[PDB]
Amino acid sequence: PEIWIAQELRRIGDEF
Amino acid sequence: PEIWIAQELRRIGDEF
Amino acid sequence: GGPTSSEQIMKTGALLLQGFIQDRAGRDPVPQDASTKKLSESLKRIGDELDSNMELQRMIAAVDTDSPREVFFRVAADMFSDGNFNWGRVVALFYFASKLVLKALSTKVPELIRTIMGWTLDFLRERLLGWIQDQGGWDGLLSYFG
Amino acid sequence: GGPTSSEQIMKTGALLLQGFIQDRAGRDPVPQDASTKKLSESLKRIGDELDSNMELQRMIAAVDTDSPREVFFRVAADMFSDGNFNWGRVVALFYFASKLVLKALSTKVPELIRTIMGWTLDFLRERLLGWIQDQGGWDGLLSYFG
């Protein structure tokens, strides 16, 4: 849930 | 202001 | 009780109002039997008519809404202060309630942005700021963006 | 102080965030010097990119926001829990803050409608209901509407 989102924002940040 | 609106809603209600 | 009963009056009133306000906040849909649906449709038409009353629209925007509840009760009281009633007035009142909802948002949203900014900048300040300093501040992001 | 100073970091951060959140709430514009404006433009592009991440969009919608502050701090904490930093993460965080604003509204607005309905139906009940009863209730408005 909330935890899903954090992991996605992290994946996205790192890819950038 | 607030008073302007009340008078307009009244005019409008009555016309209906 | 029938239509004249206070229960039906309050119930149908709540459905009509809710449907009306939700319907207005276009610029979860409410459960309605057939006759209520017909009334709801006529109300929408009138709301749409009033939206074109540009001066009225100008004055609702100009309204000091530090206290939207105060606004509602001052207006409702003033509308009916002469002791008269008609359906036009009840409808004009319902219309105003729906406009107050839009208007109330016009105040809550700066507040909300400010609130969320509060959390973000608090977090940034206590947790990210060290690292940002290591980049030479936001000029670092300018660099990051090629 | 220059860009590395906490003051500039906090100031420019506030301008970037505010501009970013206000910019996102499209689906008062903020004062920015030139370099800040360039950063702001790149941020908008990224926000626009992330809006197309449909799964992310699906999950923000699904988020229990009984406590949006709790949501923000749980997410912010989880994003950086590994002790790493980069500009991608700061931006992804800023993005999330702007989404929380939209999300917070998704809860305040039912509440607000309910609140305003509360005033209206309270007023109706104590002041209009007698007259409505004289019309035979809302079936009277059906009649009024020809």
Author numbering:
A (entry chain B), B (entry chain B): 144 to 159
C (entry chain A), D (entry chain A): 11 to 37, 48 to 166
Provide excerpts from the study.
The intrinsic pathway to apoptosis is regulated by interactions between members of three factions of the Bcl-2 protein family: the BH3-only proteins such as Bim and Bid, which initiate the process, the essential effectors Bax and Bak, and the prosurvival members, which oppose the action of both other factions. Unlike Bak, which is constitutively anchored in the mitochondrial outer membrane (MOM) via its C-terminal segment, Bax is largely cytosolic in healthy cells and accumulates at the MOM only upon a death signal. Core/latch dimers of Bax and Bak form on treatment of the monomeric proteins with certain BH3 peptides and CHAPS, and Bax and Bak core domains form symmetric homodimers, supporting that unlatching the core domain is a necessary step to Bax and Bak oligomerisation and permeabilisation of the MOM. Bim and Bid are both potent direct activators of Bax, but Bim is less dependent on interactions via its ‘h0' residues than is Bid.
